[PDB]
Amino acid sequence: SSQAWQPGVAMPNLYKMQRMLLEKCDLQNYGDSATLPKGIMMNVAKYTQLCQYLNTLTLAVPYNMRVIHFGAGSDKGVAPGTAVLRQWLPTGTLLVDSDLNDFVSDADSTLIGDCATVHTANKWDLIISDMYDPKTKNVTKENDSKEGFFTYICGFIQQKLALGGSVAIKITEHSWNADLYKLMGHFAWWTAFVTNVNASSSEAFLIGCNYLGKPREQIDGYVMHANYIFWRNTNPIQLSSYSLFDMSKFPLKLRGTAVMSLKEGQINDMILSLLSKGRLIIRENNRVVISSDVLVN
Amino acid sequence: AFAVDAAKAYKDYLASGGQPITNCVKMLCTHTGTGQAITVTPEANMDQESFGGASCCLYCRCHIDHPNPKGFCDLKGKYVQIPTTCANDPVGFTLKNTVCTVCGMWKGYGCSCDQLREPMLQ
Numbered sequence: 498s499s500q501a502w503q504p505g506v507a508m509p510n511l512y513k514m515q516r517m518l519l520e521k522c523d524l525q526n527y528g529d530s531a532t533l534p535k536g537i538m539m540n541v542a543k544y545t546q547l548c549q550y551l552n553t554l555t556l557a558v559p560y561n562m563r564v565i566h567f568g569a570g571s572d573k574g575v576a577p578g579t580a581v582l583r584q585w586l587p588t589g590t591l592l593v594d595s596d597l598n599d600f601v602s603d604a605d606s607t608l609i610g611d612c613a614t615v616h617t618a619n620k621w622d623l624i625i626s627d628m629y630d631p632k633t634k635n636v637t638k639e640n641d642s643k644e645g646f647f648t649y650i651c652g653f654i655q656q657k658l659a660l661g662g663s664v665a666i667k668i669t670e671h672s673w674n675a676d677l678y679k680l681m682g683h684f685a686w687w688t689a690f691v692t693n694v695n696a697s698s699s700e701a702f703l704i705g706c707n708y709l710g711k712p713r714e715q716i717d718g719y720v721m722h723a724n725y726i727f728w729r730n731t732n733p734i735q736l737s738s739y740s741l742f743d744m745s746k747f748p749l750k751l752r753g754t755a756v757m758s759l760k761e762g763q764i765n766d767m768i769l770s771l772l773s774k775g776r777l778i779i780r781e782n783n784r785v786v787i788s789s790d791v792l793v794n
Numbered sequence: 795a796f797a798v799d800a801a802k803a804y805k806d807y808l809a810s811g812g813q814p815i816t817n818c819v820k821m822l823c824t825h826t827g828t829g830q831a832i833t834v835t836p837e838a839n840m841d842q843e844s845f846g847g848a849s850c851c852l853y854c855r856c857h858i859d860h861p862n863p864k865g866f867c868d869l870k871g872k873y874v875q876i877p878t879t880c881a882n883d884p885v886g887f888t889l890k891n892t893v894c895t896v897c898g899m900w901k902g903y904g905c906s907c908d909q910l911r912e913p914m915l916q
């Protein structure tokens with residue numbers, strides 16, 4: 498309708514407050530593909546609209562910003578998404594990407610292997626996940642909460658995400674996790690974003706904005722995922738890419754957000770307020786050290 | 795002394811009439827940038843198409859070693875501007891052509907240093 502000139506559509510607040518039951522996701526335009534600019538890849542358009550939307554959020558963008566991107570590889574052996582993030586993120590930003598399969602990337606460092614083997618001693622300013630297990634296509638029983646890599650992410654968000662940090666985890670109808678929705682309640686705000694170039698898919702990026710380390714509201718994963726399918730089933734989105742034709746103000750501005758190491762008890766209501774506006778990032782400022790476990794046998 | 799010179803093996807593969815290395819990540823930009831061959835952010839112009847360095851690198855793409863003692867890559871993490879008329883083979887283009895050190899434009903596709911931009915000081 499009028500949400501065609503926007504990069505995508507976010508799950509309305511009145512849909513999150515509902516308490517629906519899970520149901521088969523029946524999209525009206527499922528299968529319909531969108532018209533892309535000549536020679537542009539689908540994931541370049543997708544990551545562009547995702548970044549175009551993130552620009553509207555209260556993200557914290559400090560100097561020497563740290564960003565990790567899981568599921569950055571593709572069956573083409575390249576990282577279209579990393580290429581977009583590299584473009585969008587301020588020059589001098591530390592970008593690390595990882596995938597289960599080998600691939601070529603424009604990232605400062607790439608790790609190949611199950612995200613389970615990925616280890617780090619540093620907290621991150623932004624986490625982007627596009628991981629999807631192909632075995633999810635085999636629908637043989639009820640649509641129950643998936644574990645696999647979601648288990649890892651839910652732990653990595655709690656132990657490696659810096660207060661004030663944000664996330665963007667890709668989910669679908671069957672690729673989802675209850676504890677992931679519960680964590681969105683640990684941020685200052687959240688939503689289910691749907692790019693217009695892929696508005697025909699059940700796919701959506703759960704977006705946590707300004708991590709607080711403590712729950713602000715009590716979200717129920719199974720219920721909240723039922724609210725999402727319901728929104729997607731009752732609100733058909735028209736395929737659009739009009740936001741891709743204007744890249745004049747695409748780059749993320751270097752807001753120079755502050756970085757402080759404030760232990761665990763000096764987090765008063767004056768600081769939570771600063772975390773909820775992207776004016777502060779609470780984490781160490783040591784050197785980035787990452788590693789992947791090698792299973793010898 | 796044996797060295798697997800890939801460049802020469804790819805030029806011959808193209809001379810034999812073979813489909814070039816595809817899946818080169820093309821970026822979305824305004825097309826109003828400097829025009830320089832290699833940049834830290836898409837700098838294409840009305841006559842260029844920007845791409846992700848690593849996706850246009852023969853060595854990165856073929857999982858082989860880069861010609862350099864340390865084995866350092868100059869495209870990875872950068873953006874390579876390719877003339878719209880050569881965008882069909884971005885990898886081969888970065889091999890058959892060389893960038894200029896004075897203006898940074900592709901020699902033959904933007905550089906005009908051999909025509910006096912300034913009077914060599916005096």
Ligand SMILES: C[n+]1cn([C@@H]2O[C@H](COP(=O)(O)OP(=O)(O)OP(=O)(O)OC[C@H]3O[C@@H](n4cnc5c(N)ncnc54)[C@H](O)[C@@H]3O)[C@@H](O)[C@H]2O)c2nc(N)[nH]c(=O)c21
Pocket residue numbers: 510553554555556685686706707773774
């Ligand atoms: C996008 N967002 C929404 N909220 C929360 O949600 C409330 C309403 O925000 P909304 O996004 O639901 O509102 P609406 O749909 O009307 O607006 P839109 O999606 O366009 O959101 C972006 C625009 O909203 C404007 N805005 C600011 N305050 C409000 C408000 N109280 N109500 C509506 N819009 C607001 C901003 O100036 C901005 O231009 C905010 O008052 C805030 O608590 C956020 N909080 C943080 N910390 N960071 C965010 O990025 C964020």
Ligand SMILES: C[n+]1cn([C@@H]2O[C@H](COP(=O)(O)OP(=O)(O)OP(=O)(O)OC[C@H]3O[C@@H](n4cnc5c(N)ncnc54)[C@H](O)[C@@H]3O)[C@@H](O)[C@H]2O)c2nc(N)[nH]c(=O)c21
Pocket residue numbers: 522523524525527629630631633634636669670671672695697698699700
């Ligand atoms: C939402 N939905 C799901 N199904 C059925 O349920 C299965 C599982 O559903 P899903 O959870 O995969 O969700 P959806 O179908 O919306 O996902 P989609 O194929 O659009 O892919 C989503 C994203 O996941 C990733 N992905 C998809 N397939 C793969 C893959 N094989 N390998 C890697 N990544 C993949 C890509 O980033 C892709 O854009 C579908 O394959 C389909 O038979 C539907 N059938 C109808 N008739 N109408 C629907 O609306 C519908």
Ligand SMILES: C[S@@+](CC[C@H](N)C(=O)[O-])C[C@H]1O[C@@H](n2cnc3c(N)ncnc32)[C@H](O)[C@@H]1O
Pocket residue numbers: 540567568569570571572575576577578579595596597598610611612613627628629630631645646
């Ligand atoms: C949709 S593809 C990502 C595409 C990529 N973002 C792009 O720009 O083209 C999803 C990726 O998730 C990866 N993946 C799935 N399970 C994983 C796991 N447990 N650990 C790491 N990567 C995983 C797959 O290898 C696959 O490359």
Ligand SMILES: [Zn+2]
Pocket residue numbers: 848851852853854855860867868869870
């Ligand atoms: Zn290379």
Ligand SMILES: [Zn+2]
Pocket residue numbers: 894895896897898899905906907
């Ligand atoms: Zn020159």
